[PDB]
Chain length 527, copies 2
Amino acid sequence: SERYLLYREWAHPRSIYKKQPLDLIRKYYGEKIGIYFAWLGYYTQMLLLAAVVGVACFLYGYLDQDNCTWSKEVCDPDIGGQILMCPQCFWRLNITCESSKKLCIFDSFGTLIFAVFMGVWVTLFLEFWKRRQAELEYEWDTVELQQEEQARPEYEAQCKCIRVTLCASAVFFWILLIIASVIGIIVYRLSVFIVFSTTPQMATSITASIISAIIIMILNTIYEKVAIMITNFELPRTQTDYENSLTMKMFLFQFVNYYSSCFYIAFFKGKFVGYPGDPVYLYRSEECDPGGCLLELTTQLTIIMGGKAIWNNIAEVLLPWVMNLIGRYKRKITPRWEQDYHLQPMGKLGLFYEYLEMIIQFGFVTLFVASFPLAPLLALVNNILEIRVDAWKLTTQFRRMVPEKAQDIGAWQPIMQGIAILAVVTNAMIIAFTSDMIPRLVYYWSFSIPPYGDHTYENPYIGLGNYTLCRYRDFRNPPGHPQEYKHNIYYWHVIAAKLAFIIVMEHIIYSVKFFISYAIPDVSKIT
Amino acid sequence: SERYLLYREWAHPRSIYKKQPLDLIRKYYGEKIGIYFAWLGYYTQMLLLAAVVGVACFLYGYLDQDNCTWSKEVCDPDIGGQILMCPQCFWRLNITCESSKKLCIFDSFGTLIFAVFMGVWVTLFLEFWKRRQAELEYEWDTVELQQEEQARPEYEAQCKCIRVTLCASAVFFWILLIIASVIGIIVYRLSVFIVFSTTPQMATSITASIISAIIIMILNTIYEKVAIMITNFELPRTQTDYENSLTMKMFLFQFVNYYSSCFYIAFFKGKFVGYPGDPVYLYRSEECDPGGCLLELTTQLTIIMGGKAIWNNIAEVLLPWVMNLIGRYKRKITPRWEQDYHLQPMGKLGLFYEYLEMIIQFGFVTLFVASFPLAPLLALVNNILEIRVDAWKLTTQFRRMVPEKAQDIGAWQPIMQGIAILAVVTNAMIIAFTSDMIPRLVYYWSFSIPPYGDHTYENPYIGLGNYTLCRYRDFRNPPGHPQEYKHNIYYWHVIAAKLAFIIVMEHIIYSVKFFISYAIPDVSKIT
Ligand SMILES: [Ca+2]
Ligand SMILES: [Ca+2]
Ligand SMILES: [Ca+2]
Ligand SMILES: [Ca+2]
Ligand SMILES: [Ca+2]
Ligand SMILES: [Ca+2]
């Protein structure tokens, strides 16, 4: 009774805090299932330390929240009460004072330290993963005879370059489709901010994040179906080619869907707004708060990740169980074959979707870690739950999966490598453009001086208000400058500082990654 | 008589324009010699197209030299004759007019196009090289039984972590030694510019380049001897470990020696000079011409490469021949063994030094290609000569080398990969900081406008001259500014433009390299 023990001591909510019998699940399910579960466990282990360091940096930021001079000035009625921000489509900073209280934690030097540590942690991730992979290759004898692969039945049924190009054109067309949907989310925020105003922006951002997550979830299944149909339409000569093409297309689409809103908030929202005179029109691109949209990006990421965890895990629990229930309703002693056939077959893909979910989670954790250090914590929790729920679906709900030989996770590993190659740069960008820490450091080290400071060490504006001078979130020329409402020394200084920081961080982190890869061998000494 | 034919149709100055019998030299010398010669031939083939495109861009620059507005203004007595440059340690731009005539060609948009093409060419280099390597692996059956390697006799004579650390400390100490020698070259220019002044800077730069090349050549043999002694002092368990350690140490030292002056001119010389008030002291770091030190870097690179080619090839011809002559003088029908024993043995290293020379040439061609597009041309010539001279030294001068199995060039290939990873960035930097094209483009696209321009579309200064206002090569505040002799909008704008260009070029070129590597498979379809 291998399955009885495998369900009692594993694949059960009660046994969630027990080690995985990797050898036993290899003997039962197969090599691919075992290596997937081992990879998930190692990912959880690394995210544990990631979360510990993130919580440490978050506590550092929370402790320094009391000494946040800018946030306290925002919340100070003497100065913050006199802030007159220009309209987006004349809200004072007071309504955003509490936001600043939770925003100074988002952009603090502890967050930069954690971003550097996250680069280091991503570096340590892949090397130890491949060391463990070689260890498992030796232990389980994964390296065996790789005989010539049999052609797919649909490929041989009808026995092609133009078709591949048409498939690529359709994939890019659907990429433009989801991009247009995200633009609709931009239109939604513009349309719903006015009614919310009659701070409203916080609820608007939360609702927009919820709507975007729901749209992503809805479109995920639609693209799964259409991509399966398209990949069947094209002809891969082997099943491995089918798997690789489907992996590439699904990864591209899920990357775009999940990270389109995140990239818009990090690198597009509020970047190109100009000045109230001659504002940029498309129409009337979204603006952002003085402290940047790092708060909005953090809210969006937290909402997406938590909703994904909760709702997706509940769905993974129920949908196989719902299908089993509906099969049992179709219609008491029953044999093993009858008991197992009335369960959903896994399919030739299998763990592809769970791998895709974990890769999306890795992208959320690494690509956008400069926003809030608390992403790994919840991610760790997710992984914990994931191990059990997946195991449950592989033991009780679905049938038994045919064993497969898999010395590695497959095309997901190079994808992750590329992800890291992007993620470093992305984090740098988030610290530079998205996070307003660079302007604060620039002020603190170059403008408190007496030469720059004082310390020793249509026209709807008139219709919508009776204010004389409004403060905009830009470094452009204030009134009294010879060329007012235009770029100045401050704006180009800040942009140069951001670009120099990006270059320095990219080069230093890449050098550290190269040093770690060279010093740490890909094969363990014990192995 | 294999050697007779191999000397008649190959390894001879007359047969310099004939294809290499790769199969015949594999049958005679071995796998490693054949793969080295094939790699050199393919490198020459790629440098042929590199040189063609470089000459095309150089001709474009020479044709546009007539329309170089800045250079013609420099050579115009009405404006160029009124240029009053501040002293380095008050030379007018007229003495440098001809230099500007040959400098506008150095920094032209054709050079930027050629730098992009050089990134693309470096990308195409390695992929086709490894395709050819796999083809040769299949053809020559290079993949054979790699039995356990025998321990070195000196390693087993005396049967260690502290010793390795001491060796690394000594290597870094000698790196500091050559750095100090380059600093002495900096002191030499400061000391010899005054006597040359009594344009002098051109002759000073040429003499400094000659002296630096001679010093590099002198120190090369010294480091070869000391590195051999140190590597014998340390204990590698196998000959391959000895080869890898020697390769790393020799490559690091030769990289530092050859490229220290180049990096100083590109990224150190004239970068930190400040303003005549409170100048930077160490003492009195070197300054540069208004058009940047790209002319000096081009002169240094051309001198180093041409002198290396000519003198090093003559030495490779003569030194084995000189040793043969001195052996024959020691003391007529003689047998084969007597005829061949009176020749210098190749040694266990063999083609290591020729590989090192070619890697240094590749670094000169790629790392510094943003200076002058004519480097590949001469480099091609070098390679041509190299093939013959090396072959001669392997056939007539030295003895026959023991055949060795080498499916690849070895540790030089990853080194080259890293070189390319640096070279992209380096070229970007040379275009940004070293090349003054970015300030010219910034002016042409942002300062000709009426708001910025006028077009519609101790104190030794008084002792050394009676001038009132001198023009310095910096964007700092001119007199009349509220904070004069200080950074302004222009300087930070230019620095931001340089950093943004570097970031854009790095990302675009890296994306192109990734696309080329992914699209072009590492194995040929015919293979
Ligand atoms: Ca999930
Ligand atoms: Ca799951
Ligand atoms: Ca590594
Ligand atoms: Ca040479
Ligand atoms: Ca040579
Ligand atoms: Ca490739």
